[PDB]
Design an enzyme around this catalytic site. Structure first.
Site, PDB file in Angstrom:
ATOM      1  N   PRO A  14      36.278 -51.865 -49.147  1.00 18.61           N
ATOM      2  CG  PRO A  14      37.067 -53.370 -47.514  1.00 18.61           C
ATOM      3  CD  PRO A  14      37.426 -52.507 -48.751  1.00 18.61           C
ATOM      4  CG  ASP A  44      43.913 -43.974 -44.724  1.00 21.08           C
ATOM      5  OD1 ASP A  44      43.864 -43.948 -45.711  1.00 21.08           O
ATOM      6  OD2 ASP A  44      44.357 -43.249 -43.939  1.00 21.08           O
ATOM      7  CE1 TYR A  49      48.735 -39.778 -41.533  1.00 21.61           C
ATOM      8  CE2 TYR A  49      47.826 -41.619 -41.530  1.00 21.61           C
ATOM      9  CZ  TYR A  49      47.765 -40.497 -42.038  1.00 21.61           C
ATOM     10  OH  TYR A  49      46.694 -40.055 -42.852  1.00 21.61           O
ATOM     11  CE  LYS A  78      46.101 -41.468 -46.594  1.00 24.72           C
ATOM     12  NZ  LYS A  78      45.356 -40.622 -45.603  1.00 24.72           N
ATOM     13  CG  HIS A 111      49.454 -38.410 -47.287  1.00 25.77           C
ATOM     14  ND1 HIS A 111      50.197 -38.847 -46.275  1.00 25.77           N
ATOM     15  CD2 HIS A 111      48.148 -37.861 -46.913  1.00 25.77           C
ATOM     16  CE1 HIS A 111      49.414 -38.548 -45.540  1.00 25.77           C
ATOM     17  NE2 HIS A 111      48.362 -37.865 -45.766  1.00 25.77           N
TER      18      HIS A 111
END
Ligand code: NAP
Ligand code: TOL
Length: 313
Positions: A14, A44, A49, A78, A111
């Site tokens: 997408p 994502d 994170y 990542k 990453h």
């Protein structure tokens, strides 16, 4: 505009996804839920994170609730810099899989091209503040990524923040088994990336644009920095099309054949940001937006400039 782009692994990705960097863990489950509800199929993610568990709660709830099927989602994560060593890659991937509640990833990216010293700290620094590198050769990290494909843990592998020479290096890897499917890079009207994009595209690598809104929530924003969302020239284009500035900013990369991953945890913005398949910027708009390039990066990360693979010299 068609919603997915064909990758060189034969799968379709997408072109709009939801970013999750800085999305608070206590808000991101609802953000992802709302995003899936309003049509997003690409999320994502990244281990660094620190919110993949909470992303995963949302994904699993939407799968359990029958809102989406796994095959329709395109989940990206990542490999963090402290896991470039070949012996650490599988476990890093598996921890991400376990947190996301997935049996496979659609795309797993290196990453950053910069390996960092392994250990519990994500951002190992020396006493003077410099990133502490690892000695791992990115070509070996790439072979470890390839093994994840061959074990069924990920459907596609790619790279992020790789410059032209770094992409070339992977492409020229002796014994290369799988080309990168994607290079995810910062890209917006202030950092238009024409050369890198054309190169990747020419090689069949799809480019994903990160920080497409100029990351106004980045922790290191300064008053003097240019602001895409506040730029009168971009606002004027938005006004002409009866769209928000953010919508222009998302549509721009889409018309360059890029994937784009705006972040929000605000339900109204999550929905706004998806409403970009129903208008077109003119060729003149595109050329005008391109003209705003100033090589300005959200992710300049000057604390990493002495790393040997720092990508932005
Ligand atoms: N590969 C990498 O190295 C890398 C680096 C950076 C980013 N990324 C990925 O790219 C994603 C996007 O980049 P980003 O998070 O840096 O920034 P961004 O998407 O450019 O901007 C996010 C900021 O814009 C706000 N915002 C979102 N939609 C808006 C709208 N319609 N109107 C006004 N403000 C709006 C958000 O606020 P609220 O959330 O409060 O609504 C948030 O403050 C990341 O989340 C991450 O997934 C990857
Ligand atoms: C490669 O170096 C990176 C990479 C990312 C970061 C980030 C992160 S997690 N981002 C910019 C978001 C991302 O990389 O996706 C935050 C602070 C310092 C960083 C650094 C830094 F080196 F500055 F410590």
């Amino acid at each position: 505009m068609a919603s997915r782009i064909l990758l060189n692994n034969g799968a379709k990705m997408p072109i709009l996804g939801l970013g999750t960097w800085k999305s608070p863990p206590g808000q991101v489950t609802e953000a992802v839920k709302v995003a899936i509800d309003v049509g997003y199929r690409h999320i994502d993610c990244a281990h660094v994170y620190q919110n993949e568990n909470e992303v995963g709660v949302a994904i699993q709830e939407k799968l359990r609730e029958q809102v989406v099927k796994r095959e329709e989602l395109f989940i990206v994560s990542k490999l963090w810099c402290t896991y470039h060593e070949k012996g650490l890659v599988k476990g890093a991937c598996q921890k991400t899989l376990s947190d996301l509640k997935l049996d496979y990833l659609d795309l797993y990216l290196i990453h950053w091209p910069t390996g960092f010293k392994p250990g519990k700290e994500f951002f190992p620094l020396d006493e003077s503040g410099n990133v502490v590198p690892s000695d791992t050769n990115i070509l070996d990290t790439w072979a470890a990524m390839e093994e994840l494909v061959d074990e069924g843990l990920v459907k596609a592998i790619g790279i992020s923040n790789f410059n032209h020479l770094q992409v070339e290096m992977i492409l020229n890897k002796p014994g290369l088994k799988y080309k990168p499917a994607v290079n995810q890079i910062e890209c917006h009207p202030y950092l238009t990336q024409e050369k890198l994009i054309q190169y990747c595209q020419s090689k069949g690598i799809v480019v994903t644009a990160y920080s497409p809104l100029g990351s106004p929530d980045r922790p290191w924003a300064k008053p003097e920095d240019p602001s895409l969302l506040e730029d009168p020239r971009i606002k004027a284009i938005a006004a002409k099309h009866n769209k928000t500035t953010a919508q222009v900013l998302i549509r721009f990369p889409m018309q360059r054949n890029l994937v784009v991953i705006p972040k929000s945890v605000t339900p109204e913005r999550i929905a706004e940001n998806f409403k970009v398949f129903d208008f077109e910027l003119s060729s003149q708009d595109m050329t005008t937006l391109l003209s705003y390039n100033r090589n300005w990066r959200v992710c300049a990360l000057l604390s990493c400039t002495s790393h040997k693979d720092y990508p932005f010299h």
